[PDB]
Amino acid sequence: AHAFWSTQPVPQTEDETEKIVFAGPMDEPKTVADIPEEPYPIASTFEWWTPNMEAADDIHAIYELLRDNYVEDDDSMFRFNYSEEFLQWALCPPNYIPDWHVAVRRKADKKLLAFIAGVPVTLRMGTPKYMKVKAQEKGEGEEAAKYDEPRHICEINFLCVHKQLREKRLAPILIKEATRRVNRTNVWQAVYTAGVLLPTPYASGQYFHRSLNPEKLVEIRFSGIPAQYQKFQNPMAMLKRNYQLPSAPKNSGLREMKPSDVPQVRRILMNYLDSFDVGPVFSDAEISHYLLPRDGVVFTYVVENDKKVTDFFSFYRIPSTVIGNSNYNLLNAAYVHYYAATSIPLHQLILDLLIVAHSRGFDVCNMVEILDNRSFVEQLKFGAGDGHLRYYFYNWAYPKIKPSQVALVML
Ligand SMILES: CCCCCCCCCCCCCC(=O)SCCNC(=O)CCNC(=O)[C@H](O)C(C)(C)COP(=O)(O)OP(=O)(O)OC[C@H]1O[C@@H](n2cnc3c(N)ncnc32)[C@H](O)[C@@H]1OP(=O)(O)O
Ligand SMILES: CCN(C)c1nc(N(C)C2CCN(C)CC2)nc2ccc(S(=O)(=O)Nc3c(C)nn(C)c3C)cc12
Ligand SMILES: [Mg+2]
């Protein structure tokens, strides 16, 4: 039933997943020298291309492929429209490996047909707390602890095949070539997320959304006026009042993050992320890159009191193309990124995120139920969406975990 995934080192079923007791590799141990030197064979009318992500033209080519051919909703109404500036940010973090960005071009005209991207991440991915307890009960602690140390692996994103080339088995070719390029650098695990169900997630979470501009969301059919709003004389006025927010932040000590904040933000974030079973480890350079504000891309605020940063939050922008609406062309969404609260309840910190996003022209705030995101859903009027995000590893056995044990945000 899976002609490609049946051949790969991933858990093949839930049954098998349910029996996994320790973190560790699935495949035969290999070395760089075992891996083919030459790119995987491809049809003579195509060619491999490694884009230069500091070439504006190269970024633009990737941008147009994704604009026209990347993830849609299930009803042909919206398609993500990651910006060029976003793509440069996401695909070029500190110590990125240019060779991990893999494209296929039509040899004739250099038309971009397919793309997949890999970036480095340092991930805690050892045996989860609940399974370490089971291991102690069996006298198997050392086994359970073997892969505790953070590992330098690959994060995969932006897999895309042009609509005219779908269902021709090009995606497997891309995945095999990205795998080869990663393994040639002595890395043997990857982490990736997808909405679709593949063999086999180690975690899954629902999406949640919080309306910031209900008038617009209703006009574009992101939202409807919910049935209960009918018994009302005037549905929309009531809807706007429900989702109204303050014009200005409520925490007095809130301001935008600046470079001098990097060490303190690193400390409070890393202390917080320690409480989750799977999560990233960031250097100062990686905190700088992923969290310092960038116009139109990522937005980060700290709470500072007595000259100390005590809390922070970040969000990033992914707009979508609205297909066929005579009033609007774009949906402007804000996505909850990393945060840490030490001084105030998390709901009070994230209310200021909603206030800031609204004041900056965002239409909706999205998130997945990872981290402690469930703790502020009801008070802050988030609603569950139809969608789910599934978390996967390549070449890593891992026990099933709850999404509230996951701390990796994927863009
Ligand atoms: C150590 C390093 C390891 C590095 C790699 C780690 C693995 C990374 C894995 C990638 C993580 C990506 C994370 C993201 O970016 S998830 C976002 C994926 N992108 C989209 O949904 C954009 C819109 N769709 C498309 O561009 C295409 O439909 C894609 C490219 C998705 C499939 O193209 P197409 O529809 O033309 O099909 P095919 O004939 O070429 O290929 C059919 C085979 O592809 C398997 N398939 C379908 N969708 C996915 C999917 N989302 N991940 C993995 N596999 C997928 C499918 O089960 C089948 O295999 P099998 O069922 O027959 O066995
Ligand atoms: C995983 C697929 N998926 C369900 C969603 N993916 C992403 N991404 C950023 C994707 C992008 C591709 N890849 C990284 C996974 C992350 N944002 C979303 C935001 C909201 C929701 S929903 O609220 O449940 N309904 C909805 C909306 C409001 N737009 N669309 C289109 C849907 C279905 C879903 C998603
Ligand atoms: Mg194909």
Walk me through what this model shows.
The chain has 411 residues and is α+β, with helices and mostly antiparallel strands. Strands 1, 2, 3, 4, 5, 6, 7, 8, 9, 10, 11, 12, 13 and 14 form a 14-stranded mixed sheet that branches. Helix 9 packs across helix 10. It has a single domain, classed as Aminopeptidase (3-Layer(aba) Sandwich). It has 11 helices and 14 strands. The protein binds tetradecanoyl-COA (MYA), the ligand CCN(C)c1nc(N(C)C2CCN(C)CC2)nc2ccc(S(=O)(=O)Nc3c(C)nn(C)c3C)cc12 and magnesium ion. Adds a myristoyl group to the N-terminal glycine residue of certain cellular proteins. It catalyses: N-terminal glycyl-[protein] + tetradecanoyl-CoA = N-tetradecanoylglycyl-[protein] + CoA + H(+). This is Glycylpeptide N-tetradecanoyltransferase. Keywords: Acyltransferase, Metal-binding, Transferase. Its EC number is 2.3.1.97.
Please outline the helices and strands.
Blueprint (H helix, E strand, L loop, with lengths): L13 H6 L26 E4 L6 H14 L8 E3 L3 H8 L9 E6 L5 E13 L4 H10 L2 H5 L5 E11 L8 H14 L6 E5 L8 E9 L2 H6 L15 H9 L10 E3 L5 H12 L5 E2 L3 H8 L6 E8 L2 E15 L7 E11 L5 H14 L4 E5 L14 E12 L17
Parallel strand pairs: 5-6, 12-13
Antiparallel strand pairs: 1-3, 2-11, 3-4, 4-5, 4-9, 6-14, 7-13, 7-14, 8-10, 10-11, 11-12
Bound molecules: tetradecanoyl-COA, the ligand CCN(C)c1nc(N(C)C2CCN(C)CC2)nc2ccc(S(=O)(=O)Nc3c(C)nn(C)c3C)cc12 and magnesium ion.
GO molecular function: glycylpeptide N-tetradecanoyltransferase activity; metal ion binding
Enzyme class: transferase
Function: Adds a myristoyl group to the N-terminal glycine residue of certain cellular proteins.
